[PDB]
């Protein structure tokens, strides 16, 4: 799909893909293109949860995680229009930043 490239690190079950209204429980590490880590749920030892279709996360995450199956770990490379765009997130993400996330879909609730 546009805006997000999915490179698999380890496979999921290949059959249980997130549906609209389901809660995705994931572990992630986010980095800028130069490898600078800006956020990681793995460092907090606390999985991150979001409801698919609610737009609680950037578009690249909604569309990238929807292509993953339960148990899958993948590297998502998200273009700036599918992330924080021209503004970025002041003090964390610069303008027009491509973001790289190592995401593991742990389970669906």
């Amino acid at each position: 799909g546009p805006g997000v490239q999915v490179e698999t690190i380890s496979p999921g079950d290949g059959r249980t893909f997130p549906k609209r209204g389901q809660t995705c429980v994931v572990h992630y590490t986010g980095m800028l293109e130069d490898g600078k880590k800006f956020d990681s749920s793995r460092d907090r030892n606390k999985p991150f949860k979001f409801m698919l279709g609610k737009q609680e996360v950037i578009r690249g995450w909604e569309e990238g995680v929807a292509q993953m199956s339960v148990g899958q770990r993948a590297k998502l490379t998200i273009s700036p229009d599918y992330a924080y765009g021209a503004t970025g997130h002041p003090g964390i993400i610069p303008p027009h930043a491509t973001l790289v996330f190592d995401v593991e879909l742990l389970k669906l609730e």
């Binding site: 956020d39 996360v57 950037i58 002041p90 003090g91 964390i92």
Partner: protein, 318 residues
């Protein structure tokens, strides 16, 4: 409605900046229920909101003040600013374009409105002015180390930007005009906000435009001038010997409501006027001491003004 694994805001803030982890800021911002508009101003509006049964303040910026949202979000995300007398940041989110800044909620409201609803005794007056001095000294002082912070000047200190906490102490809010400085690189980060300070509280050097804009120390002296004006507003409301003054903003008697830059420049620079000290303050030891402190914030020469740390120490001895 509670699920196993759910965290409260306190747990999410315990962990990288002043607020929630980066991705968590958007998720939490987009899960808040707005409830009641508790303030409006040049900045836009502020609302009491709720997230999982917890109150938060949601500041929704006007289209005219987008650069203050950028600057305040930048500051709280790049500096770990966690102090009892500095408004706690939780999250910033962009969602027409809406710019949100979420912070702790202080149900007592601003000091400006608080001073109009009640009089103060020696206990509540000293708690207020000491807590403002403590927050201001924490902003001004640079801390070295990985648990440190650059020195920060506010540039818009005033009673409307100070919130009263449930315990009677205050916290300083609005870092949209703040400037940062670090001794290691002598780097001054002034930002790109065209906003200027509130006219009524502008120091003489800001009004006559002689302030040295590339000197961090100059911005600390502007904050000290404005602190002295806030001290005067608070002291007026402390009862002594059955007497108390009505709430008035600084320069109430010589400038109109919404004074212009020229109204202020004529009073403060041309005529070198300062707020008047009521005669009854000299009969009370606490007010006599505060009148002495106030005057030391109001010298025309900014270099003569005392530091936030010297104010805090003086207040700790009263």
């Amino acid at each position: 409605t509670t699920n196993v694994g759910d965290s409260t805001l306190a747990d999410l803030l315990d962990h990288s900046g002043s607020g929630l982890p980066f991705l968590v800021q958007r998720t939490v911002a987009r899960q808040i229920t707005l409830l009641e508009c508790v303030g409006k101003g040049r900045y836009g509006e502020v609302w009491r909101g709720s997230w999982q049964g917890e109150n938060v303040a949601v500041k929704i910026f006007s289209s005219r003040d987008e650069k203050s949202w950028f600057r305040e979000t930048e500051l709280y995300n790049t500096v770990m600013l966690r102090h009892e007398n500095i408004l706690g940041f939780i999250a910033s989110d962009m969602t027409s374009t809406q710019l949100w800044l979420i912070t702790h909620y202080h149900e007592m409201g601003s000091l400006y409105d608080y001073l109009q609803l009640t009089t103060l005794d020696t206990v509540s007056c000293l708690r207020i002015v000491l807590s403002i001095a403590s927050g201001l000294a924490h902003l001004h002082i640079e801390i070295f180390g990985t648990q440190g912070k650059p020195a920060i000047a506010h540039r818009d200190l005033k009673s409307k930007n100070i919130l009263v906490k449930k315990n009677g102490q205050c916290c300083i809010a609005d870092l949209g005009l703040a400037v940062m400085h670090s001794q290691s690189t002598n780097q001054l980060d002034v930002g790109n906000n065209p906003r200027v300070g509130t006219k009524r509280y502008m120091a003489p050097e800001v009004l006559d435009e002689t302030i040295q804009v590339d000197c961090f120390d100059s911005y600390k002296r502007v904050d000290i001038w404005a602190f002295g004006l806030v001290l005067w507003e608070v002291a007026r409301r402390m009862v002594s010997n059955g007497i108390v003054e009505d709430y008035k903003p600084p320069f109430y008697d010589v400038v109109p409501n919404d004074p212009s830059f020229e109204d202020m420049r004529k009073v403060v620079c041309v005529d070198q006027q300062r707020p008047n000290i009521p005669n009854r303050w000299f009969s009370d030891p606490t007010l006599t001491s505060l009148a002495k402190l106030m005057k030391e914030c109001w010298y025309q020469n900014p270099s003569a003004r005392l530091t936030a740390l010297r104010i805090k120490k003086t207040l700790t001895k009263i």
